[PDB]
Design a binder for this molecule. Structure first.
Ligand code: PX4
Ligand code: PX4
Ligand code: PX4
Ligand code: PX4
Ligand code: PX4
Ligand code: PX4
Ligand code: PX4
Ligand code: PX4
Ligand code: PX4
Ligand code: PX4
Ligand code: PX4
Ligand code: PX4
Ligand code: PX4
Ligand code: CA
Ligand code: CA
Ligand code: CA
Ligand code: ZN
Ligand code: ZN
Length: 164
């Protein structure tokens, strides 16, 4: 099962975001492109509609933070945790908080925001991990370029199991 166990449900269809704050590590244009491109994965396989606002409330608050920051959790440092993604719904939750003591880079063997944000939006929609050794929701990372990116049959099967 590629779904999160429990009853993940948003009951919301038209979803929006704001990028809270821009990282020094990779610049604001390259962030807002990476997070556009992340979102635009799951629209090609969802009936959900995703938009960006510049006024009002973001449903999925994308925020770049470090430390014991709130929410008890903690972000670790360089390495370890890449995101605190929540699960779906209104309020605090439905959100994907990234670690900023992480050093995020668009180079092939450095920490990729695109490939993480995709699963972190997935975590937020109610997806867990996959178990086919070609999937993106597999635990271990495998690097794939931004634009030659494709979801694997298992991963598509898991969002279609959930929203079908
Ligand atoms: C009817 C008559 C009306 C007259 C109107 C006069 C004109 C008013 C114009 C208002 C201009 C408002 C500017 C604006 O919205 O600023 C918002 C910003 C950014 O919003 P946003 O982009 O979400 O920033 C997010 C990132 N973060 C969390 C790192 C801040 O916010 C900031 O960047 C954060 C600012 C923090 C200030 C903190 C001060 C704390 C200590 C002082 C507390 C005093 C309490 C009374
Ligand atoms: C009449 C009774 C007293 C009323 C005066 C009370 C004091 C008002 C304080 C306003 C302080 C303005 C501070 C400022 O520069 O705001 C910039 C905002 C930007 O907000 P935003 O775009 O959210 O910035 C986001 C940053 N990000 C993405 C990295 C997270 O940009 C704006 O939203 C555009 C408007 C900025 C200026 C607003 C105030 C103009 C002057 C107000 C009165 C001055 C009297 C000397
Ligand atoms: C002694 C105790 C009292 C001290 C009072 C201190 C008041 C401090 C006000 C300014 C705080 C600014 C701190 C700061 O650097 O925020 C940076 C962020 C993100 O930085 P980040 O992008 O994380 O990289 C930081 C280093 N960088 C750019 C050189 C590569 O940038 C943002 O997230 C965007 C928001 C930009 C606001 C630009 C506002 C400039 C006006 C500052 C106040 C002017 C009064 C003359
Ligand atoms: C007698 C009790 C009367 C009560 C009347 C209250 C009526 C208020 C009407 C509000 C309608 C417009 C709302 C709207 O479009 O808001 C947009 C912005 C504020 O957006 P906000 O996201 O807060 O700031 C956006 C920019 N950012 C991110 C850089 C900070 O803000 C704007 O762009 C500026 C719009 C100013 C609207 C002034 C309307 C004056 C009508 C006054 C009627 C008689 C009052 C005596
Ligand atoms: C200390 C600082 C001030 C703190 C208080 C500020 C005000 C508190 C109440 C704010 C309520 C704002 C209402 C407002 O946003 O109206 C906006 C509309 C439509 O804007 P729209 O952009 O569609 O909705 C904005 C919000 N958004 C971005 C999240 C989707 O646009 C309007 O429909 C147009 C403007 C109409 C104003 C009419 C005022 C009528 C007064 C009549 C008096 C009759 C006396 C007999
Ligand atoms: C000079 C500038 C100073 C600024 C100081 C801080 C001011 C706090 C402003 C809070 C205003 C929030 C306005 C609000 O309506 O936010 C709504 C968003 C989403 O609402 P949403 O369900 O999308 O639309 C509501 C329904 N509609 C379409 C029928 C209007 O939902 C929210 O984002 C959830 C509510 C957040 C509550 C935050 C309340 C803070 C109170 C303490 C402020 C202390 C400031 C020192
Ligand atoms: C009745 C009135 C109520 C007054 C407010 C009460 C609020 C009480 C609840 C506080 C919750 C604080 C949660 C928290 O730690 O948020 C921190 C955030 C982000 O996490 P963090 O990673 O710490 O941000 C570090 C800087 N960054 C963005 C560049 C990576 O921090 C940021 O994004 C920076 C925001 C601007 C902070 C500028 C400095 C404010 C100094 C004064 C604080 C006054 C508090 C009363
Ligand atoms: C100032 C006069 C001298 C004070 C005596 C100090 C005596 C020893 C105190 C304990 C030693 C603390 C040393 C220190 O600098 O701690 C600062 C802390 C944490 O520093 P640190 O953990 O490096 O910050 C890491 C990064 N961060 C912000 C992203 C989490 O900073 C924070 O965690 C930020 C605190 C934010 C509080 C915001 C308001 C929260 C309570 C509001 C309640 C409102 C209703 C009452
Ligand atoms: C500043 C800008 C940048 C921000 C960067 C990201 C910063 C992250 C801060 C962490 C996020 C903060 C959001 C927040 O409001 O959390 C409040 C928490 C829990 O809210 P809650 O609605 O319980 O959480 C529901 C959703 N959940 C469990 C799935 C997450 O609640 C608590 O923390 C507990 C607080 C004590 C509440 C005690 C009760 C108050 C009412 C008492 C009524 C007494 C009646 C006699
Ligand atoms: C003598 C006993 C008296 C008790 C009176 C009531 C006390 C209620 C507040 C209790 C707070 C206790 C500590 C706690 O739960 O902190 C929660 C988290 C901490 O996560 P953590 O990362 O450990 O925070 C490090 C510190 N920080 C945020 C400054 C970097 O930090 C948060 O997540 C920050 C966000 C907090 C949102 C608070 C919203 C309250 C909404 C209440 C509306 C109803 C009021 C009637
Ligand atoms: C209570 C009298 C307050 C008078 C305030 C007048 C000024 C209001 C300024 C605007 C504040 C925000 C208005 C608001 O509810 O906006 C929507 C947000 C977020 O919407 P969303 O995230 O979609 O959640 C929607 C579902 N909903 C509304 C049922 C929670 O929903 C929320 O953020 C819910 C926030 C709830 C705060 C409840 C505090 C109870 C304290 C104990 C009071 C005891 C009463 C006897
Ligand atoms: C007679 C009637 C009196 C009514 C008084 C109001 C009573 C009801 C208050 C609202 C209660 C909820 C407040 C709260 O927790 O706001 C948090 C929001 C976002 O939390 P949210 O993401 O909505 O989840 C909150 C969950 N909750 C309520 C279960 C804790 O936080 C945010 O949206 C961020 C806001 C950051 C504001 C920082 C302002 C710093 C100072 C700015 C400059 C001031 C210059 C004058
Ligand atoms: C509600 C009543 C009780 C409230 C009690 C709490 C009051 C707290 C007020 C805020 C004090 C700041 C607390 C604190 O030390 O937190 C630590 C932050 C570090 O967080 P952050 O900057 O994210 O971490 C920096 C390091 N980095 C890039 C590797 C991640 O910051 C630092 O370590 C430096 C703190 C610098 C303060 C003075 C800044 C002078 C700036 C001069 C440049 C602007 C001049 C206009
Ligand atoms: Ca980390
Ligand atoms: Ca949310
Ligand atoms: Ca960083
Ligand atoms: Zn957290
Ligand atoms: Zn993963």
């Amino acid at each position: 099962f590629r779904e999160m166990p429990g009853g993940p449900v948003w009951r919301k269809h038209y979803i929006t975001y704001r990028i809270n704050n821009y990282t020094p590590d990779m610049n604001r244009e390259d962030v807002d492109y990476a997070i556009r491109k992340a979102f635009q994965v799951w629209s090609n396989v969802t009936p959900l509609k995703f938009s960006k606002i510049n006024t009002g409330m973001a449903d999925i608050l994308v925020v770049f933070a470090r430390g014991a920051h709130g929410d008890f959790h903690a972000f670790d440092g360089k390495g370890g945790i890449l995101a605190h993604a929540f699960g779906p719904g209104s309020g605090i939750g439905g959100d994907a908080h990234f670690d900023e003591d992480e050093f995020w880079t668009t180079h092939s063997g450095g920490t990729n925001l695109f490939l993480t944000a995709v699963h972190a939006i997935g975590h937020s929609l109610g997806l867990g991990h996959s178990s086919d050794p070609k999937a993106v929701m597999f635990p271990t990372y495998k690097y794939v370029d931004i634009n030659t990116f494709r979801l694997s049959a298992d991963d598509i099967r898991g969002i279609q199991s959930l929203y079908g």
